[PDB]
Amino acid sequence: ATETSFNFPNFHTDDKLILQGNATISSKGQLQLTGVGSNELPRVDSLGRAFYSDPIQIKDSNNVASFNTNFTFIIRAKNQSISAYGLAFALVPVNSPPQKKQEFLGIFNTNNPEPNARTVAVVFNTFKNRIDFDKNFIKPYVNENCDFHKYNGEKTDVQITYDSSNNDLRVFLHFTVSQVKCSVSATVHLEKEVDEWVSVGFSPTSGLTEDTTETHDVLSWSFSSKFR
Numbered sequence: 001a002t003e004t005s006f007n008f009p010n011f012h013t014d015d016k017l018i019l020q021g022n023a024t025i026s027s028k029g030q031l032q033l034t035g036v037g038s039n040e041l042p043r044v045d046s047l048g049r050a051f052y053s054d055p056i057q058i059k060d061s062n063n064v065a066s067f068n069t070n071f072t073f074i075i076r077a078k079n080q081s082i083s084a085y086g087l088a089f090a091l092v093p094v095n096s097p098p099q100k101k102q103e104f105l106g107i108f109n110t111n112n113p114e115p116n117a118r119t120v121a122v123v124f125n126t127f128k129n130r131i132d133f134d135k136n137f138i139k140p141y142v143n144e145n146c147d148f149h150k151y152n153g154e155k156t157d158v159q160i161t162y163d164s165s166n167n168d169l170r171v172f173l174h175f176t177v178s179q180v181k182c183s184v185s186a187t188v189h190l191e192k193e194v195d196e197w198v199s200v201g202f203s204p205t206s207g208l209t210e211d212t213t214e215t216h217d218v219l220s221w222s223f224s225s226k227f228r
């Protein structure tokens, strides 16, 4: 097998998922990335990551996989205007452990390029209020403004595609009730950024205070890699 495909209409404990840091599945079937404390309130300065347990094959040899992933989430904060830090969809080395917290979203360690992070991520930067497409670097390759401070607090549907033919990544975000849309596009050669097999999933980090913290819950997720 070269082609992977799964579908979580909701989450459960017995699922093919690897949870790291404070991430847990709620009794309602929700993937709570940054977690909830003993008093059931969002955790401050919390990091939680979660990946499909099977590694995914990006490079077959010469042929690169194309992929399509759809997921929907909700970020709820006490004060969204000051919410931090965000949620990430990332391709990482297979058993990589969580990196740094805060603005590092648990996927990076430095303010400098990390060519050996072998990570490619799409961050819904709730801190800086934009959508970032990061390539082995915490500083975005291409970023687009998206008003999370205003439209968060509602199901948001994300759709991410990668076509190895034109080597383009396309992200389409849609806030479901406010109806607001955001999107960014970049030209990437996945094969030059990540390994032949990677772990696919999410990683979020919450603010260092009761006011700046928020939730990062994923309510559903689908994925399909394809070797054409």
Ligand SMILES: *[C@@H]1O[C@H](CO)[C@@H](O[C@@H]2O[C@H](CO)[C@@H](O)[C@H](O)[C@H]2NC(C)=O)[C@H](O[C@@H]2O[C@@H](C)[C@@H](O)[C@@H](O)[C@@H]2O)[C@H]1NC(C)=O
Pocket: 021, 022, 035, 037, 043, 044, 045, 046, 047, 048
């Ligand atoms: C998971 O949730 C905990 C909060 O509900 C995090 O602990 C908090 O970490 C702060 C420093 O990052 C520290 O000042 C807080 O006092 C502490 N709160 C509690 C209740 O422990 C936890 O962070 C990890 O665990 C703490 C104890 C420290 O050792 C940190 O260095 C750890 O990262 C959250 N994050 C993770 C990744 O578990």
